[PDB]
């Protein structure tokens, strides 16, 4: 049986369109370019000013987001246009798949652990549906509650039932990196 997919699919037009949609979502000022300063500011602004992160939590979360978008070639003080963005995302996905195969903590998992410690009011690495609605709407990556509910349908939720970083890292492997058909609708209709 197929547990996952460790092969890239960068020529898939739906993979390009998935991250082009994300690029336009991150380019809120329609400059055609985004910077690491803007991404980390957005990330820290959410957890600090919307989710009540402690200074210790925000520091760990900041280093995780910084390493994530930095893995796509984004740097402080440097503006990244779309050609340099999607090319850097090929390098990010390639490096993450190497960490997946090596059973090495990936950048997307480290971000999830740091973020879920903030989003989970119990700080046990497991978020409820309401907490997932609270983060994704604050970040804006999901706008409707209907699409947030699709996430908990796609994910193997536990008996609570909450979503943990293990399951979300499994779904993000196929959604952001390898275009796993079983990971479709992970963000509902919010992300193509
Ligand atoms: O993954 C996530 C993501 C991805 C992307 C993005 C971006 C570009 C792209 O080209 C493809 C994908 C974007 C976002 C949005 C964002 C938040 C803060 C700062 C900047 C952006 C998220 C959040 C989120 C949840 O949606 C957090 C998370 C990770 C790991 C985990 O286990 C659980 C939750």
Residue numbers in the entry: -2 to 189
Describing publication, verbatim:
The Ca2+-binding photoprotein aequorin is a complex of apoAequorin (apoprotein) and (S)-2-peroxycoelenterazine. apoAequorin, which consists of 189 amino acid residues, can be regenerated to aequorin by incubation with coelenterazine and O2, both in vivo and in vitro. The crystal structures of the apoAequorin complexes with (S)-daCTZ and (S)-HM-daCTZ were determined, suggesting that the hydroxy moiety at the C6-hydroxyphenyl group and the carbonyl moiety of the imidazopyrazinone ring in coelenterazine are essential to bind the apoAequorin molecule through hydrogen bonding.
As the deaza-analogs of (S)-daCTZ and (S)-HM-daCTZ were regarded as coelenterazine and (S)-2-peroxycoelenterazine, respectively, (S)-daCTZ could be used as a probe to determine the recognition residues of apoAequorin and (S)-HM-daCTZ could be applied to confirm the binding environment of (S)-2-peroxycoelenterazine in apoAequorin, as previously reported. Moreover, the deaza-analog of (R)-daCTZ and (S)-daCTZ for coelenterazine inhibited the aequorin regeneration and the inhibition with (S)-daCTZ was stronger than that with (R)-daCTZ. The strong inhibition of (S)-daCTZ and (S)-HM-daCTZ on aequorin regeneration indicate that the deaza-analogs can generate a stable complex with apoAequorin. The asymmetric unit of the crystal contained two molecules of the deaza-CTZ analog/apoAequorin complex and formed 16 molecules of the deaza-CTZ analog/apoAequorin complex, similar to the case of cf3-aequorin. The p-hydroxy moiety at the C2-hydroxyphenyl group was stabilized with I105 and T166 through a water molecule, identical to that of native aequorin. Similarly, the regeneration to aequorin from the apoAequorin/(S)-daCTZ complex by incubation with coelenterazine was performed, and the results revealed that the deaza-analog binds non-covalently to apoAequorin, enabling the replacement with coelenterazine to convert active aequorin.
